[PDB]
């Protein structure tokens, strides 16, 4: 969208509603492939609800975005390159939006708990410029997001269920090496209705399902080379006491000379499977994770689809 100009990005609406129209401040990258970062501090220091997410963004220009949730933004200037970071803190992310994927919109009732005593004071923009050709005219980027907040409690919580392997060596050579995660979910019921999966170049594909009785219920399946926005769960699923979250990533050792294992570069590979849910609020989370595989033997019955790219 234009460049807002100075009207300000803080539209209270009314006693318990604000926008936050958090927007770069007049961008203009010069080379291709630029992450920027900006922050803006809640306007409120008690808890509210983010309820709303309204992308805008040039789509010649802007490949992808994600706003994050923290306490400690990486810096604090009114813009910087975070190819680095993006928060010192934990970066809940909250929104991702990919030129090309329809961005899921939180279901009916749905908000992300921020501020007050333990909630993120700050969210954290990033925007991803890709071909810059559209800045040979040196005009100026105001890329963001559109947040709308209440103060009104919501029925439903939203969360991220994170999965992640830690253990994972894939030999060079070895063709197929898989990355299996598994916990027993042990909490209130979750609603999972959206999922984002993360890799490094090794990756062939990512799945991840809730078992229960044996059955497996796929949450999503995705090529981890595809842009990383949330993708709809296709049939979303009730997670619930005594079912498996269970997640397979497929791994090659091919184009490599040394043993590649886990860690933060490209030349490291990762496992990730991001789970988007909601919560009765008064049983909320609003993170979870899974950094073990506590069912391998379960993974014989795994479906066909988890070991065949798309
Ligand atoms: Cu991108
Ligand atoms: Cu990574």
Not at 53 to 68: C, E, G, I, W, Y
Not at 204 to 223: A, F, H, M, P
Not at 269 to 277: G, K, S, T, V
Not at 285 to 309: G, Q
Request: charged share 20%.
């Amino acid at each position: 969208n234009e460049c807002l100009g100075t009207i300000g990005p803080v539209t209270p609406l009314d006693a318990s509603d604000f926008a936050l129209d958090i927007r770069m401040p007049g961008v203009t990258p010069k080379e291709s492939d630029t992450y920027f970062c900006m922050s803006m501090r809640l306007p409120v220091d008690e808890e509210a609800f983010v309820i709303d997410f309204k992308p805008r963004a040039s789509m010649d220009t802007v490949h992808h975005m994600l706003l994050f949730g923290c306490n400690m933004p990486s810096s604090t200037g009114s813009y910087w390159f975070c190819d680095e970071g993006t928060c010192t803190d934990k970066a809940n992310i909250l929104y991702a939006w990919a030129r090309n994927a329809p961005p899921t919109r939180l279901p009916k009732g749905v908000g992300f708990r921020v501020g007050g005593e333990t909630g993120s004071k700050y969210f954290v923009l990033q925007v991803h410029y890709g071909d810059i050709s559209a800045f040979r005219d040196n005009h100026k980027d105001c890329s963001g997001v559109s947040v709308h907040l209440t103060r009104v409690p919501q029925p439903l919580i939203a969360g991220m269920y994170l999965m992640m392997s830690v253990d994972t060596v894939i030999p060079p050579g070895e063709k197929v090496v898989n990355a299996d995660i598994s916990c027993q979910y042990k909490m209130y019921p979750m609603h999972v209705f959206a999922y984002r999966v993360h890799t490094h170049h090794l990756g062939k594909v990512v799945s991840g399902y809730r078992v229960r009785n044996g059955q497996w219920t796929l949450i999503g399946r995705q090529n981890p080379q595809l842009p990383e926005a949330f993708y709809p769960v296709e049939h979303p699923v009730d997670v619930t006491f005594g079912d498996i979250l269970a997640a397979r990533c497929v791994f090659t050792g091919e184009g490599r000379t040394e043993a590649t294992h886990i860690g933060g570069t490209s030349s490291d590979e990762m496992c990730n499977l991001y789970i988007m849910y909601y919560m009765e609020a008064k049983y909320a989370l609003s993170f979870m994770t899974c950094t073990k595989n506590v069912a391998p033997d379960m993974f014989r019955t795994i479906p066909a689809e988890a070991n065949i790219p798309i």
